Amino acid sequence: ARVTVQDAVEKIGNRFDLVLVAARRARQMQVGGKDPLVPEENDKTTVIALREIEEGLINNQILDVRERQEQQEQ
Amino acid sequence: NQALGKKAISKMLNTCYRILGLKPTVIFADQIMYTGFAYAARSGASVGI
């Protein structure tokens, strides 16, 4: 659980953009067709995406490249 | 090393924020409230005529 979202904020620094990035990641994990890249502690998708951003393995650019890779695969 | 009369304690929280960060300040604020309540209850301060 993310009591504070400071780490994600410095990872991508806007305090306004990480809301959008984490919303996109949480949508991907919640609608379907995606699995978390961080161990799951029975958290909701929200703080899971926040933890993924904090660990530095999710941002806007790599999300775009994964979307492009999925489009190229199909 | 003072008396901490609501002006030193806000100053010390401010310095904690400006030096350490956000989350250590949050932990510090919670612990300050806990210990303040505990030692106010231990103190037994009361008003009499």
Nearest CA of chain A to the CA of B7: how many Å?
Answer: 26
Is the Cβ pair B22, A6 closer than 8 Å? yes
Report CB contact under 8 Å: B22, A3: no
Cα-based distances in Å from B6 to A18, A29, A52, B31: 36, 47, 39, 16
Number of A to B CB contacts under 8 A, please give it: 8
Resolution (A): 3.4
Chain B environment of A4 (Cβ under 8 Å): 22-23, 26
- The technique by which this structure was obtained is cryo-EM
Report chain A residues touching chain B, CB-CB < 8 A: 3-4, 6
Q: Which candidate, A29, A31, A28, A9, places its Cα nearest to that of A18?
A: A9
For B1-49, the DSSP string reads -----SSHHHHHHHHHHHHT-SHHHHHHHHHHHHHHHHHHHHHT-----
* Number of residues that this document lists for chain B: 49
User: b/e for B6-30, b at 16 or more Cβ within 10 A?
Assistant: eeeeeeeeeebeeeeeeeebeeeee
Residue from A3, A4, A10 whose CB has the most chain B CBs within 10 Å, to mutate: A4
